Design a protein around this ligand. Structure first.
Ligand code: 2LO
Ligand code: N6I
Length: 116
């Protein structure tokens, strides 16, 4: 299998993570982990078995926790799939998620090609 230095993944992928963060207000619900107590939604962790958010992805990328770049792609799509699963299609959060996913799909393709 192919070997990737943590520093190579960090430098290559950080611009794509910035592209998500800079979407305002769409990234705001995704910048920190969903807090079901604060939001009053105790069933969140029953429906969403594997929570994910931008802060967790950013920490994994900054600290060298990904073995290969498709694991970062996996985490980003997990984040988006969790939001589309939990929230109504008509809801703000679902629509914000769809904006972020549109940004991500545009940005991630050339980066993954260059990482080989
Ligand atoms: C700016 O955008 C919003 C602002 C408020 C709401 C309703 C309340 C809220 N409703 C939220 C819903 C989610 C969420 C996600 C993401 N997936 O399932 C759920 C539920 C996550 C966070 C949510 N939050 C917290 C939001 C983002 N605040 C954080 C601190 O500063 C002000 C805004 C929704 C949105 Cl989309
Ligand atoms: C593009 C796209 C759109 C939507 N929309 C939802 C509703 O609104 C309209 C469409 C949902 C998606 N779900 C996923 C998805 C993954 N994609 C990989 C892709 O990024 C990718 C694939 C090959 C190479 C590269 Cl470089 C990147 C991977 C794992 N699990 C996933 O669910 N992709 C979706």
């Amino acid at each position: 299998k192919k070997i990737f230095k943590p520093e190579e993944l960090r430098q290559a992928l950080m611009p794509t993570l910035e592209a998500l963060y800079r979407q305002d207000p769409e990234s705001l619900p995704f910048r920190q982990p969903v807090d079901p107590q604060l939001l009053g939604i105790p069933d969140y962790f029953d429906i969403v078995k594997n929570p994910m958010d931008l802060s967790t992805i950013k920490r994994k990328l900054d600290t060298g926790q990904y073995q290969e770049p498709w694991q970062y792609v996996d985490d980003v799509w997990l984040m988006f799939n969790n939001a589309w699963l939990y929230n109504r299609k008509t809801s703000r959060v679902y629509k914000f998620c769809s904006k972020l996913a549109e940004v991500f799909e545009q940005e991630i393709d050339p980066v993954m090609q260059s990482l080989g």
